[PDB]
Design a protein around this nucleic acid. Structure first.
Ligand SMILES: [Zn+2]
Ligand SMILES: [Zn+2]
Ligand SMILES: [Zn+2]
Ligand SMILES: [Zn+2]
Lengths: 172, 186, 200, 72
RNA sequence: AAUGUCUGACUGCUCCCUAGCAUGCUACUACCG
RNA sequence: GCGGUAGUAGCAUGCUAGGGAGCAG
């Protein structure tokens, strides 16, 4: 709804509302990433900051929403449930696609990463071991990062047709 | 539940059933690939079920033994955890009197009773050697717990009353090192 | 879960056939299992093939097929050897040091403590191996001289109520917490243990 | 802030009691008296002076080697 | 040499975990009519 | 082509029992 000087020819000036534009962007997948609107289109990806969370950053704004101040002061409306009626929560995981920690042969001949295995780190080495120690440390750090963000209060959501099997299938 | 030979069996069953429904076969052939695929599910559901049961069983066993180990190891070490917690709290408080007496005690000056509060009620202190006496008892006054005290009697380790002016740096070896001071509140 | 008693590098492994069950980094555990009679390692789970009856307790004969542990004749088509690359499949594999003179502990473990030379060996190593030799010497004493214990059950009664019987004439040890025995059921076949057992 | 005083007084009494001080009688009575007085105080200053009077007990004994924990 | 034991009332409601049984619901397979 | 019984698994509800906890007078 506020396009810059340039990128205006890219980013068309649009304010969203499910009272209108609900029927146009039907193709593909939207992406509301911290742009707080009304109920979202059924094929969206959103990271909306929760407001009832407490901390020392966010401050009691108005009205029934809070002012979230760390860099530039962001004001966000009151958290409501009727915004995600067309979406579902996002279960945690950890996709990845990269080479394997191969201190030698690249396939089946290089493991030496002793892990009691997870069930959701859909990495590239999930055979039996099952995480190239590379991906082991990467999964550890990414898990910590997800935890910290969600503790600082960010609630993700996804379209209801989401699945996890398909990434596994993409691996092969 | 993928890492199963029964998974390969069931997947071959699904693929063959798909071939039967996609090739336009006759009526009884799809019954062979429906009765076998359904016996295939009646075995695959079953083996995946039992394996997830054994898995969750091992998992709850793990959480139980973890709970036990944690609880016992903590119960072992209360006598020290409490002390370290107490002292970090005391340091975080940051008051003048508390820190005064803690530093006096880590040097060697400890009381011999409860520090009273009224202007009466005596107070006794142990002095280890005379330097701290310089840093503290100056004349008839006495500063302890950030409050003023009047010295009224001194004595060394062998219960000998020791005159005030008697003490000095020169005569210092002429006294038992652990002196004792009896003061009152100002 | 501990520190390699030789290397201090953090180990999740213990030496099974060894009397004290100590912590040895992947390299040190490797060295012990290739330089002594100790072929059993103890971690979160005991290292053995989990095929029915496959009593493969040799550390060098196990392969991680699927999620369970397997011998050669049992490993599914997806596996690899644990005892390989100079180290063992043990946690903290990268942060492993490998002691240079494992022969020290390799001799402290496979001795009998009846010869004075073993006492010289204990007196003539570093302080860590000194206290290790202390623990293992007291352990050799108690396992030999200080009291004893084999008993064969007569019949089961309930989940925690059991008829026993030692061997007539064999040292019948006291029944205390600091007295546990390796429970062996032999099918015919299958010299498999059922764990550690104290009685009262 | 005052809550911090009340809290550290609780912890201090716990330490004293686990150092077997309740074996002696009159001393334990005094310690309990000071603790229950601190828990009900309203202003910070007199609570602080009761706190120092009560800490003097732990300092008067040689069971806790403060020169160790005062290492920061 | 032991081992072992230390003060915890009467009620009411609620959550969590496990077990058992029956019942109830649904699917797969089998036999006979 | 149907019924029935028997099995097995899945799922639910309920009741009992066992254990852990919370609040109330
Ligand atoms: Zn990899
Ligand atoms: Zn080592
Ligand atoms: Zn050994
Ligand atoms: Zn085997």
């Amino acid at each position: 709804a506020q396009p810059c000087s340039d990128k205006a020819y890219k980013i068309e000036e649009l304010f969203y509302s499910y009272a209108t534009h609900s029927d146009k962007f039907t193709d593909g997948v939207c992406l509301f990433w911290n742009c707080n609107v009304d109920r979202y289109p059924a094929n969206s990806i959103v990271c909306r900051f929760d407001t009832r969370v407490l901390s020392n950053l966010n401050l009691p704004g108005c009205d029934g929403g809070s002012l979230y101040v760390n860099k530039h002061a962001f004001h966000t409306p009151a958290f409501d449930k009727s915004a995600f009626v067309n979406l579902k929560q996002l279960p945690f995981f950890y996709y990845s696609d990269s080479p394997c920690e191969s201190h030698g042969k690249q396939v089946v001949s290089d493991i030496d990463y002793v892990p009691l295995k997870s069930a959701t780190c859909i990495t590239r080495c999930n055979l039996g071991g099952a995480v190239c120690r590379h991906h082991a440390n990467e999964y550890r750090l990414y898990l910590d990062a997800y935890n910290m963000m969600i503790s600082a209060g960010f609630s993700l959501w996804v379209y209801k047709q989401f699945d996890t099997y398909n990434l596994w299938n993409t691996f092969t | 539940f993928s890492s199963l030979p029964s998974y390969a069996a069931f997947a071959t069953a699904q693929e063959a059933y798909e071939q039967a429904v996609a090739n336009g076969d006759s009526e009884v052939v799809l019954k062979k690939l429906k009765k076998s695929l359904n016996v295939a599910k009646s075995e695959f559901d079953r083996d995946a079920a039992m394996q997830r049961k054994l898995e969750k069983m091992a998992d709850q066993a793990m959480t139980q033994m973890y709970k036990q180990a944690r609880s016992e190891d903590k119960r072992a070490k209360v006598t020290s955890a409490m002390q370290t917690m107490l002292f970090t709290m005391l340091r975080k408080l940051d008051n003048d009197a508390l820190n005064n007496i803690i530093n006096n005690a880590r040097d060697g000056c400890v009381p011999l009773n409860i520090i009273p509060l009224t202007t009466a009620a005596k107070l006794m202190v142990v002095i280890p050697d005379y330097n701290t006496y310089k840093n503290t008892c100056d004349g008839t006054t006495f500063t302890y717990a950030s409050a003023l005290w009047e010295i009224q009697q001194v004595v060394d380790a062998d219960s000998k009353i020791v005159q005030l002016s008697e003490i000095s740096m020169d005569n210092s070896p002429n006294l038992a090192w652990p002196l004792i001071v009896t003061a009152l509140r100002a | 879960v501990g520190a390699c008693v030789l290397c201090n590098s953090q180990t999740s492994l213990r030496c099974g056939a060894c009397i004290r069950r100590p912590f040895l980094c992947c390299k040190c555990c490797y060295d012990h299992v290739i330089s002594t009679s100790h072929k059993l390692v103890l971690s979160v789970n005991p290292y053995v093939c989990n095929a029915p009856g496959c009593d493969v307790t040799d550390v060098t004969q196990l392969y991680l097929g699927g999620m369970s542990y397997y011998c050669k004749s049992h490993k599914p088509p997806i596996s690899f050897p644990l005892c390989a690359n100079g180290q063992v499949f043990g946690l903290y594999k990268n942060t492993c040091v490998g002691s240079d003179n494992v022969t020290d502990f390799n001799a402290i473990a496979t001795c009998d403590w009846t010869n004075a030379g073993d006492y010289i060996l204990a007196n003539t190593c570093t302080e860590r191996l000194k206290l290790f030799a202390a623990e293992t010497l007291k352990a050799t004493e108690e396992t030999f001289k200080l009291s004893y214990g084999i008993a064969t059950v007569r019949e089961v009664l309930s989940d925690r109520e059991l008829h026993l019987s030692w061997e007539v004439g064999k040292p019948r040890p006291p029944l205390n917490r600091n007295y546990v025995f390796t429970g062996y059921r032999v099918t015919k076949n299958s010299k498999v243990q059922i764990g550690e057992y104290t009685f009262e | 802030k005052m809550s911090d005083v009340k809290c550290t007084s609780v912890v201090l009494l716990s330490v004293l009691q686990q150092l077997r001080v309740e074996s002696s009688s009159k001393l334990w009575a005094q310690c309990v008296q000071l603790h229950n007085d601190i828990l009900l105080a309203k202003d910070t200053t007199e609570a602080f002076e009761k706190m120092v009077s009560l800490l003097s007990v732990l300092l008067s004994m040689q069971g806790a080697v403060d020169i160790n924990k005062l290492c920061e």
